[PDB]
Symmetry: C6
Subunit: 115 residues, 6 copies
């Protein structure tokens, strides 16, 4: 019942978290085309989930400086970053992103995952 529920005021602010840092070694063509990507058959993708969304800019910059990856897209509204390149380059980029956001800027972090 309406009458039995506690009510609280919640003041919302974004957290600081990298929720996902995932490599897909051999992505299906239908999927990556729907994402707007232009890849070689040999290319892997790396996928990041980041809050606050503006920190996507930091991650994308770190990833592209880290190694030989291309920026697939950055979405500064949602926080999403997708990168592409060889598996080892994508792994190094994701590791650098996690070191900067997680260790340097004290975001809540995660380990790299892979399909």
């Amino acid at each position: 019942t309406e009458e039995s529920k506690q009510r609280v005021i919640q003041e919302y602010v974004p957290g600081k978290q990298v929720t996902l840092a995932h490599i897909i070694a051999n992505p299906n063509e239908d999927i990556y085309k729907k994402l707007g990507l232009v890849l070689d058959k040999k290319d892997a993708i790396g996928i990041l989930t980041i809050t606050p969304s503006e920190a996507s800019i930091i991650a994308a910059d770190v990833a592209t400086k880290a190694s030989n990856v291309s920026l697939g897209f950055i979405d500064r509204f949602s926080g999403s970053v997708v990168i592409s390149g060889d598996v080892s380059s994508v792994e190094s980029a994701l590791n650098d992103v996690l070191e900067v956001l997680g260790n340097m800027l004290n975001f809540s972090s995660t380990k790299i995952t892979r399909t």
Copy 2:
């Protein structure tokens, strides 16, 4: 009253969860056409709700690597993934997704459900 309410600061981050993994065996054409789907009338569809939304990419990739399953759509903004194919292939694909996201990536998961 305004004066009696507790106030908390909530720092929001996305959870890690597959909330829904549902099969519709013989979907109504008006529904699937409004979703932008082109199906055979023996096709089933599979529907996924995923958080964070980016993990839809993972799920769609895992599902469409499944035999005889086609991507309906992926919405990387909302997390949604809809797939299509014969009912058994669709169930297999959904289960692959739950195994990758739930077991390997430690997402909260759900059982596959179906419209009877």
Copy 3:
């Protein structure tokens, strides 16, 4: 004061709930035109609020199989489903939606309401 407020991290996920399952027997023409509907004067509408939003697809399919209702619209982003038909057909459709989502899929549910 800022300093006196507890802070918690909230990881958000959608709930599983049908919040509203409502019949309007004789809807005002201005309203249903603004909603994009094409009705007979005799048609009722049924309105559903559903989380997660993708479950709108399940509800719409169940409703249209249940009885002689037309799909007014489905909004897969918000979860909304509006159906139209005679009152008894709309009632049977809403009941079927509630049985499937509420009883079969264990969503939090509600009773049919009417204006």
Copy 4:
């Protein structure tokens, strides 16, 4: 610090609430024109905030069945409903909405307020 914060999973669902039911008796023309309204300069407006957003349809229907009240707009996405007409008719319509949503559908409700 990051390390000291409690972490909870929150499953979100819409509440059932009319947060605002407000009359503006003689609204400024620059405001009502920015809202897309065409009024007589004796018209008042009535403003509703409703959750879940779909219940705006219910409220708009109840309000516009009220004598001498016109629909300004309905926003089924946000829940908003704005109506117009003479001040007493607008108040009557708002009260009808609060009676249906608050009393009959058990929404949390509010009192009608007005810009004095």
Copy 5:
């Protein structure tokens, strides 16, 4: 770990709050042009943050009746209201908005701030 987190269902509704009521005496031209404003060099702006978003309509109406301010914009989706005029007119408008929303309608309120 996933397994260690408490889960609660949160039913969301908008709060009633004026979070910000701020005057910028001499706004930078680049900023106010990006906001779509047409000002004199001498004009100040007032900025309001309001929940629920529909109460922006009430605030904008009160502000424009209060004093000699122009409505810069109203955003009924987010709640935002920006007004412009001389500093003293903008201050009187903001004070009237706070008296109506805060004192009359019992919104949680704030004091006027200035740059």
Copy 6:
């Protein structure tokens, strides 16, 4: 289970917080071009996350009154502000923003961070 979950009504309002105030000294051109920026290749950028979103207007105004700093963009919907200029000027501007919002307006604040 559905039956075991506590249920609370949460009335949402925006917090008052600068979550991020970050300098990138030599940003990659593919990144800054995707953000719509035109820079010199000695320019740094400064990135702000602000709640409530309207306070981006305050921050952008304070920052661009700083010497040798240009507005990259302001997003009044999300709260974001990106600025550009030589690294020291950008840091000075970010610090001015933290002083106004954090100290004078009592927002929760953060330290300036930088990509090393």
